[PDB]
């Protein structure tokens, strides 16, 4: 059985849906300390934005999310009909039928990653300054992948630092963060390795994108053994998008070329689970240095 399963009792309560859990005070206190630790490592000159759990469907479509991960997307739908129509849908439900046939799409989707809304915001400001722009973003994200594994959730918190600038601005940013993130993971007493990887692009066309991404080392992951040392869990990622989003959003660097972008992403729930898997569910029994690092 899954080594993580036994953690559930102290960390979560069931909400009647795989990958969607209520969080206990114990669990939340650690998510919060991890967030503050990440904040304490923020670089100077970084603009912090917090996003809600939904974003514009038009913006997500434009970002190319449908060509890449259509199977993971959560769209918002509602009952947009007349009073008569809505009442009938409710009455069908009372009579053993399906009220959801009266749903139609809203102009919103659940956010699949925290960075997406930042690109049009940056674009709206005109050409980037020399050195580019850096953002500290967070959102509750959603991916339609039900699982009973505690490290694979449908609704989860993502924290990211995003750099938008020249190729050199962005690649140096990513290298700074790859070193810094590993130092944080060591301070937290976590066991990990860093390997290159690829996003789960969908379909035949996706195997090619995944191959190129891996081959060009556009994505590193910090991997922590949770379920097994043979199938470790990615708890952070370090991503390089080249000019893909700079081109999509018409972002120009200080030299007048389409900007490059990259981000370092922290899976807050995976990291919290990793802390509890690694040091157990009694905080007073955590190593003193770990407690100190987290301000406990």
């Amino acid at each position: 059985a899954d080594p993580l399963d036994h953690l559930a009792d102290k960390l979560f309560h069931s909400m009647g849906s795989d990958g969607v859990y209520a969080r206990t005070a114990l669990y939340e206190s650690i998510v919060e300390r991890l967030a503050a630790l990440i904040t304490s490592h923020r670089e100077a000159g970084t603009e912090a934005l917090r996003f809600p759990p939904v974003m514009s469907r038009a913006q997500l479509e434009k970002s190319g999310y449908l060509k890449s991960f259509p199977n993971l997307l959560g769209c918002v739908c509602g009952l947009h009909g007349t009073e008569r129509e809505i009442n009938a849908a409710v009455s069908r439900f009372d009579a053993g039928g399906d009220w959801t046939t009266s749903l139609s799409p809203a102009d919103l989707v659940l956010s699949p990653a925290a960075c997406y809304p930042v690109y049009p915001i940056a674009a709206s400001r005109g050409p980037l300054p020399k050195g580019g722009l850096r953002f500290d973003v967070a959102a509750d994200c959603f991916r339609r992948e039900p699982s009973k594994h505690l490290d694979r959730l449908q609704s989860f918190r993502m924290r990211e630092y995003v750099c938008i600038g020249t190729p050199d601005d962005v690649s140096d940013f990513r290298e700074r963060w790859m070193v810094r993130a590993q130092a944080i993971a060591r301070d937290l007493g976590l066991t990990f390795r860093v390997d290159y990887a690829s996003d789960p692009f969908f379909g035949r066309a996706g195997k090619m994108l995944a191959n190129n991404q891996r081959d060009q080392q556009l994505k590193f992951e910090l991997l922590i053994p949770l379920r097994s040392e043979e199938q470790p869990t990615a708890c952070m990622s370090f991503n390089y998008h080249r000019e893909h989003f700079g081109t999509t959003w018409g972002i120009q660097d200080a030299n007048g070329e389409p900007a490059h972008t990259g981000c370092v992403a922290f899976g807050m729930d995976r990291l919290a689970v990793a802390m509890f898997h690694t040091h157990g569910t009694d905080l007073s029994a955590w190593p003193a240095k770990v407690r100190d690092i987290l301000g406990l």
């Binding site: 190319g64 060509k67 035949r204 066309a205 195997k207 090619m208 994108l209 191959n211 190129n212 081959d215 060009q216 893909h244």
Partner: protein, 77 residues
Amino acid sequence: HMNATIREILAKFGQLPTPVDTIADEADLYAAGLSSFASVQLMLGIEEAFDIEFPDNLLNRKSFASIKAIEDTVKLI
């Protein structure tokens, strides 16, 4: 003939700025303006026009770097 088919597809899906007539067999398509997403459509276009399907070993940047690379790959398949 195989050469010219590939060329029509490169104008079909390729999304390139300069015409396929203005591109040599052994020439850098990515430098020419073949984007990532485009190269994937191109690959799907090749698959449709020749009714074949690539192995995952050749599902990469290398196989589509040039018309010649494309031709050699399709032939070797």
